[PDB]
Symmetry: D2
Subunit: 386 residues, 4 copies
């Protein structure tokens, strides 16, 4: 039951299943994985593909000859398995040089270095067939108020993104960028902390059409925000270029639990939205197999991500298709929500005595919304209790 | 010391000092205030002006003759005191008709009614001299996932805002709109939950130049976000049309404490930013004198808002002017943050061996940022311990 | 399917289904319910009983003759339906006199009044057959640091509880007290904010055996705490005298959603714990039918509380009974967790070279815990995907 | 101004200033410090002493001869400087063996090992003169619900603590234990998550008099709790054996900012409470110099901890001593809060018509608490604006 296949478009970062378990308070609990092994094991599980940071695939500091060999072996694994690489990103956070940021480091030399490191990897991402290039500005921010003038930092961030858009345009690449927001951790506050902030920022770029968002479940939940609502807004804006799926139990450190763990009902409403909107991009998991687990547990966690997506997909579909639910949705006036408020125009609205002078506000107020009955139908579908 | 005058541009909502103390679990602890009394008392405290919801000034359901008399007496108080009315807003949340929203109610008749109620009040706001019209979509949202299709709701919200922009344009009014975001309460999740979400939404409106934001301290803090950072972004976008000042102790119900209470250091960095950016609009307080207080305590709380702003203004100014701080800011490379990363252009960056092939990343990494020393100078200034 | 009967011990507060929908920003959306109607309607739904605050049953200020008639009619409804009243409590929060608390009001006269109001109602609770008397110190706390000396307030709270224990003892009543913790709202911070704080406090009372806790799902979740873990601790202490079931979506205002909404997986693990521990008390719902709902929606929400409990009970039972789960639990060493660490004693532990000098820490470290596989079995059971 | 001296009893963990800057997403930014250097540098700053985990002082795996030399050199530094070691603790979290806990690991062998590792270090702590032995159960908990039966885990935790109390008693040591609560991180939820939970647990131990708490500012703030209120309760219980001072900006990952950063007003009310209660133990800082900082910044951050404590101490003292504040405190009835509610006894209270039948609740309700004026006096004192 609920067996993934590559047509489901499930993808995983190399850094997910490859996480060695080092946390702020603990040493590694697992050995490093060869990317080749991870491709092979994921393929066996039904995955469609993998994503990488530059430094996951090619150890920082590698010679060109080493670099060539790492890529060659990785490409052989993809060829052996039929796995794709839909997305890649740059590690602008691990090396101590990025301690005050990459693109918005106070030190100009560091900003220039961050751009050069990104550009090098964009070339590689294209060669591997990636359609999306993610930027996660995890070190862009501050722990204290004087340390970063945020207007200056946003000027730097815009400059960076504008230069990367010039580069892709100059090379004739089809690849697009996706900003992954996060509100805090590792910096006390991170710039562009939410989907809303990233969307707004994009509209200030020279070529806004090249940039979207890569929202992560856990990250919006770390601000206590409603993830399906943020995704709806991104979709509404035409900017959902990629999505990062995982779980998170509330407002705390970034847990990166397997998808479906954490807020299960939010997961349900997310899959409902993605499927009903016809989202066609990768279903990418950015999760950490807990450091309690050995390698068998790693592969169990990854299989569980995909399984949970497919179960929720089934239940959401059954929800939307159920004639009793369709009736409930009409009872709750969701059909009315989708109709124009005033397609008649402003003057007609102004002249419509039924909209004000003769509006019976007490009758309107007395009509129940019937949302509880609708929501219990949703719960019954999720739990298979219909 | 730290005595407000009207040139400080301190304003208060009628609903702030007029709050009767009714909370979810308690009845009113104070009698209603006549708006006339509130204007008079605020003026005596050094305030510049007041703001109102339609229903604060004119009781819901009033006849035209009653409406005329309420406005006449209010205008006499303004004339008697020299107080201004820089901003107004519509109550689209108290009456049970708005239980599922105003502009995004599922019921079309309610949406039309909300627009008509707003338009009526825009006319009044203009007559009273307001430059900004605030919209706080406090009932726009949901407690359950099926109850609101957010893409449909955003279509409705855009339609609403677009119609209001048509109206103001058709009448030749100079007034501009400001959206006040809030993440939750009274709905489980509110649409446009943060400054970022509101900014992004504005860029989809037919006339984006007519709309900005009215961020509230407590509201961004309820998402655990950094308020000065959100304000920086709004300023960066040219959209800080108004601001709502108050205090909040973390992620919980909307406390609306007097400004300076709550996160005191965040208040410091906010006033530093507003003053250094030359923000010229009203310094508006949206606060609730706690229901423990009698009328003397109400006026004490209001005086305290203004006092705290003025103390922080002094300390921030002293901070920025201190030659030791200026030296620390250079030590922390804040001057470098404000310089272009690559004014030489993309090709020059690509050809610059100092940016990659010959960049000494270990030397760069070893340079401390000196942010702790800078931050302690900031603390010493805030506390007057220099 | 999943039809409640009175043997399930489902109970509801009169204030739950009777909530008129007044919130901080909105007027009532529903008329008041007669308690008699609520008893009748709940009975029809399969409920076992109801609970009350003094002022839910008898309007504040009632004459003795009015008081007698209100009780008489309520008792007739219980007799007509077979409904029980297992728990009652005092309203020490709505009336403005309690604005700074009841038992810990700074004003001594108010503290004395709060005690007298409680004692009167304890007599009534006993006459109605209640076994538990709840205290929810919702106004006991502060919005500012100087307003309440917490050590003095805890002295007052102890004095209050000690006097109530003297009273029940003096009258020969079998009733026991249960403290309901809440971290904030309506006060900025509430005293005894969590289950842990209440448990600790109880151990300082003169007769600790008379006092336990009445933890509420939403309340521990408002501190971001794990509700099933808090309940485990209360059970471990022998102090789970009653429980309040509802839902809550994270750290925000107290939502009081119907049970099962909110954190669904946490609900699962709670019902698993209650059932496996053989908790025998009332399954009490403290929920608010959302103010969007009319009276039909009220009864739908209440039915949904019970339905969700029964679904989760089935799934948890199936989980624990499944031989594959039992195998997984052994693989994860849950059986070992339940065995003594050192039943051999301290000296034997000290002399055991296998515990230190010859302990192979690397072998131990390499053993995976297999928790992900266990957790996915749990998810598959919850969702009926086995 | 505000220069620390050893009589201030400021102490630091070796792991604080010695933090190399490794975070979940980043490599070390600073070299390791020799404990000897840290003692010397702290002494120069005015510190009173240092604390250690076993593994901070003696590298895990050291031979007895290596162990002897590490201790010898450390003791020479203490002798050279006059620095004390008031507290020590065991590292039961870094090594992968502790991935599922120490005392409550599901694997019995690990639990036994954790006890043996602790006991060894208790002997060392005593030899170095420590009066308090801290336990921080950072790995005791779970990320999923089936992984840990919390009642079984609490049985194991009690067994562990009981054995350690037997050991100290058997050796005639004067040292006492202090449990340091934390709600989450590194485990999804940590057992004994708050001060309240730890206090309650202690009352179940065989010798409760040997155990107290070591509350940390940031940790209670991570649950959104009021730290000064938790400290008041610990003091009320007679269990404040030690305290960990730092800063934290709200509900998020454990930031461990320097004391005074984070919630500045909460810091004020904490120092006010500690000083007014006559807390006589170490003022211990558990802080992380941000990884942006070089070694000069490390020492700046440490100096800042002490400076901020001393500034707040001055301001709190000035607050309490100010005759206008004393008048305000009487106006707010804080003196009445400190008087018994019913020293006359239960019968007299029952017979007192002024407490109920003749209590004028409307007069009582109308009396304002004057808390805003009191709180603004507090703000004016904190900011030196009197
Ligand atoms: Ca994440
Ligand atoms: Ca607010
Ligand atoms: Ca509640
Ligand atoms: Ca900490
Ligand atoms: Cl922007
Ligand atoms: Cl948008
Ligand atoms: Cl206690
Ligand atoms: Cl306990
Ligand atoms: Mg991600
Ligand atoms: Mg506001
Ligand atoms: Mg309750
Ligand atoms: Mg600590």
């Amino acid at each position: 039951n609920y067996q993934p296949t590559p047509e489901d478009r499930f993808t995983f970062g190399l850094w997910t299943v490859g996480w060695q378990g080092r946390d702020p308070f603990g040493d590694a609990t697992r050995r490093a994985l060869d990317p080749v092994e991870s491709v092979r094991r994921l393929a066996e599980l039904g995955a469609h593909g993998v994503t990488f940071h530059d430094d996951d695939l090619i150890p920082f500091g590698s010679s060109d000859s080493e670099r060539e060999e790492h890529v060659k072996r990785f490409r052989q694994a993809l060829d052996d398995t039929g796995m794709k690489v839909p997305m890649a990103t740059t590690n602008l956070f691990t090396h101590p040089v990025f301690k005050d940021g990459g693109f918005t480091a106070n030190d100009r030399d560091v900003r220039r270095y961050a751009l050069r490191k990104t550009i090098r990897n964009i070339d590689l991402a294209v060669e591997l067939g990636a359609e999306t290039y993610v930027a996660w500005g995890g070190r862009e921010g501050a722990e204290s108020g004087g340390a970063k003038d945020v207007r200056d930092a946003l000027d730097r961030m815009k400059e960076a993104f504008d230069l990367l858009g010039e580069y892709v345009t100059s090379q004739g690449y089809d690849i697009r960028f996706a900003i992954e927001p996060k509100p805090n951790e590792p910096r006390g506050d991170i710039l562009l902390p939410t989907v809303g902030h990233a969307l707004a920022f994009i509209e200030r770029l020279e070529r806004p059409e090249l940039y979207g968002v890569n929202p992560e479940v856990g990250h919006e939940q770390m601000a206590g925000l409603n993830f399906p609502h943020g995704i709806a807004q991104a979709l509404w804006a035409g900017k959902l270029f990629h999505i990062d799926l995982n779980g998170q139990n509330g407002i705390k450190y970034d847990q990166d639990l397997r998808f479906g763990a954490g807020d299960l009902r939010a997961a349900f409403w997310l899959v409902d939205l993605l499927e009903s909107a016809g989202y066609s991009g990768p279903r990418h998991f950015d999760f950490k197999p807990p450091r309690t687990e050995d390698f068998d547990g790693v592969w169990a966690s990854a299989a569980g991500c995909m399984r949970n997506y497919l179960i929720l997909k089934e239940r959401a579909a059954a929800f939307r298709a159920d004639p009793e639910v369709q009736e409930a949705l009409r009872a709750s006036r969701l059909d009315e929500l989708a109709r124009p408020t005033a397609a008649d125009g402003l003057q007609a609205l102004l002249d419509d005595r039924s909209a004000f002078e003769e509006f019976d506000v007490d009758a309107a107020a007395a009509r129940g919304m019937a949302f509880e009955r609708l929501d219990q139908l949703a719960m019954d579908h999720l739990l298979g209790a219909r």
